[PDB]
Design an enzyme around this catalytic site. Sequence first.
Site, PDB file in Angstrom:
ATOM      1  N   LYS A  23       7.690  -2.851  53.261  1.00 46.63           N
ATOM      2  CA  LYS A  23       8.327  -2.262  54.427  1.00 46.63           C
ATOM      3  C   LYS A  23       8.157  -0.738  54.305  1.00 46.63           C
ATOM      4  CE  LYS A  23      12.968  -2.492  56.792  1.00 46.63           C
ATOM      5  NZ  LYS A  23      14.338  -3.170  56.700  1.00 46.63           N
TER       6      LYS A  23
ATOM      7  N   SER B  57      15.011  -5.442  60.617  1.00 49.41           N
ATOM      8  CA  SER B  57      14.013  -4.379  60.645  1.00 49.41           C
ATOM      9  C   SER B  57      12.795  -4.601  59.753  1.00 49.41           C
ATOM     10  CB  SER B  57      14.672  -3.054  60.267  1.00 49.41           C
ATOM     11  OG  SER B  57      15.443  -3.177  59.089  1.00 49.41           O
ATOM     12  N   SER B  58      12.819  -5.595  58.857  1.00 52.51           N
ATOM     13  CA  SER B  58      11.615  -5.921  58.062  1.00 52.51           C
ATOM     14  C   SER B  58      10.590  -6.773  58.877  1.00 52.51           C
ATOM     15  CB  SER B  58      11.976  -6.640  56.738  1.00 52.51           C
ATOM     16  OG  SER B  58      13.025  -5.989  56.030  1.00 52.51           O
TER      17      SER B  58
ATOM     18  N   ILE C 138      20.816  -4.663  55.665  1.00 54.11           N
ATOM     19  CA  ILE C 138      22.175  -4.123  55.679  1.00 54.11           C
ATOM     20  C   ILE C 138      23.035  -4.892  56.664  1.00 54.11           C
ATOM     21  CG2 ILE C 138      21.874  -2.358  57.433  1.00 54.11           C
ATOM     22  CD1 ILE C 138      23.646  -0.481  55.533  1.00 54.11           C
ATOM     23  N   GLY C 139      22.390  -5.577  57.607  1.00 56.87           N
ATOM     24  CA  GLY C 139      23.045  -6.551  58.497  1.00 56.87           C
ATOM     25  C   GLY C 139      22.197  -7.785  58.818  1.00 56.87           C
ATOM     26  N   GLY C 140      21.163  -8.032  58.006  1.00 62.35           N
ATOM     27  CA  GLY C 140      20.316  -9.227  58.150  1.00 62.35           C
ATOM     28  C   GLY C 140      18.825  -8.995  58.190  1.00 62.35           C
ATOM     29  N   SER C 141      18.393  -7.784  57.869  1.00 63.32           N
ATOM     30  CA  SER C 141      17.048  -7.349  58.165  1.00 63.32           C
ATOM     31  C   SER C 141      15.946  -7.895  57.272  1.00 63.32           C
ATOM     32  CB  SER C 141      17.009  -5.821  58.176  1.00 63.32           C
ATOM     33  OG  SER C 141      17.592  -5.334  59.386  1.00 63.32           O
TER      34      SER C 141
HETATM   35  C1  LIG Z   1      18.932  -5.169  59.550  1.00 58.41           C
HETATM   36  O1  LIG Z   1      19.699  -5.171  58.568  1.00 58.41           O
HETATM   37  N1  LIG Z   1      19.357  -4.895  60.792  1.00 58.41           N
HETATM   38  C2  LIG Z   1      20.731  -4.567  61.107  1.00 58.41           C
HETATM   39  C3  LIG Z   1      21.078  -5.018  62.521  1.00 58.41           C
HETATM   40  C4  LIG Z   1      22.533  -4.696  62.885  1.00 58.41           C
HETATM   41  C5  LIG Z   1      22.842  -3.217  62.699  1.00 58.41           C
HETATM   42  C6  LIG Z   1      22.374  -2.688  61.328  1.00 58.41           C
HETATM   43  C7  LIG Z   1      20.921  -3.051  61.041  1.00 58.41           C
END
Ligand SMILES: *C(=O)NC1CCCCC1
Length: 545
Positions: free
Chosen positions: A110, A185-186, A206-209
């Site tokens: 990434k 985001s990955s 950090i929230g599922g990326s």
């Molecule tokens: C990956 O971790 N994406 C997250 C989506 C929700 C907000 C923080 C970033």
Amino acid sequence: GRQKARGAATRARQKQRASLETMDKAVQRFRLQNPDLDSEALLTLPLLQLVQKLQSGELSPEAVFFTYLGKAWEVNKGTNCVTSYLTDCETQLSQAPRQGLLYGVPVSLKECFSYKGHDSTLGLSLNEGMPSESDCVVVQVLKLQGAVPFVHTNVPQSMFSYDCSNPLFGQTMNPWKSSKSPGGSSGGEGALIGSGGSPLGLGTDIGGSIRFPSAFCGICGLKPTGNRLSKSGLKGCVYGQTAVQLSLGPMARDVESLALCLKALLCEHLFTLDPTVPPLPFREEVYRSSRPLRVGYYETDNYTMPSPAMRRALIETKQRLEAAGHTLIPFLPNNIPYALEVLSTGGLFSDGGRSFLQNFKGDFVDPCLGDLILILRLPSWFKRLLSLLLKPLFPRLAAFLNNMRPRSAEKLWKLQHEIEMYRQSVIAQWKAMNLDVLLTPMLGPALDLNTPGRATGAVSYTMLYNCLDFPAGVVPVTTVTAEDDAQMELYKGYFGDIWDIILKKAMKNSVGLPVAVQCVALPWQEELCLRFMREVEQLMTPQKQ
Ligand SMILES: *C(=O)NC1CCCCC1
Ligand SMILES: [Cl-]
Ligand SMILES: [Cl-]
């Protein structure tokens, strides 16, 4: 006031273009000198067999490198997942340590994993023409283990997203259907690995990326406990935010690849290059155990209504685990709304988004971020007011707005303690049912391009385990059937707010797309998590093992 940012875009795209050309020229030269190499058979070898053949000498590092380099170039044509070719990686290839556990393995990174001489833009103009002075710690360890990092892969602008577009390198597409997001985001990692262009990658979450892209693209991913691996040298947008921790981890076509990666990373090299990471080596015997598990499970978090495909994936996996001899125990972590609306939102937006917004000054705002920036820009009072107006009709939206307000250090300490006591709550809940691991739904199938940034509610399934900082991974278990997709016309959602409405539309027209489940263990329990993931993989898709 954006001309400077137009210049960044022009320069970034030139470097991406030249990288691609450099790659192709090397691939074309290599193929001419090796016309009879069975490239298909090499590319479809599982990582574990590939590694073994490199270790025995059956396959040359060069043969493996240039074949994957060829394939990455080709799958990039339909996905736009590669932002940069890591310039010195051929000279790295020839110097790879022989005894390394990853000797000769091409690995994709990434874009935020700093690599010497290269930008980590995060799609942001201000990080363009700002090349890293050195490799980050996990990239150092990868190379010390014999691996060959070869490309940087695309992310959504700022990474604060689960889509994958930015104004510098543009938009990454799902390799199964080009109208769909690869997740994020990955997402560049998801698209590259998911179409066969790399056998192993690193992402962050950090929230599922790690988990969105893995799920949406039909591959495996693991988000460890935040501090199991080194974050040293990682590029970011916001620094010093410690309430909800960042985790980094592997993505790959199978679970065994994830376990290999963690084993190779959790070595002395890592522990000495970053002494702030607890020196916990990979525990093979926990990973390889075949003892029956007590598996807690839920079909819904009562927050984001599952798609029919998600629900079928979860129930089917449950039934197979039962038949294989595991005890399946209904279990749902308490107070999920609180964990999401107050703890997670408040942790990520404790300063009202101010630190985050400075990265966007003078820059374009990518459409895939939705109204996020606009909403963050609003005054703390006009957020508060709009929160009170929306509360009767739309309680989710109201809570979101109210919990992304700036607050004092005093209030942040209180929030940090609530997160800690919630963690202990769920641990106690878990121990009272004597769980070993937890099975949950995972968001899927892949949403339409430019809809994740308008379906914020849907992060509920993954974000909960960032808040709790529990290891969590995802495994593909099925694909969307004509019936699953047809049944989406009957989807309503628990709230009926814009997030439910966008998600419903976003998930339609997904026949043939992969769908995952999520596997969770307690903190520091990555090996048990992977064991369990291995079990799911074996029962729902046995041809992987
Ligand atoms: C990956 O971790 N994406 C997250 C989506 C929700 C907000 C923080 C970033
Ligand atoms: Cl200007
Ligand atoms: Cl710690």
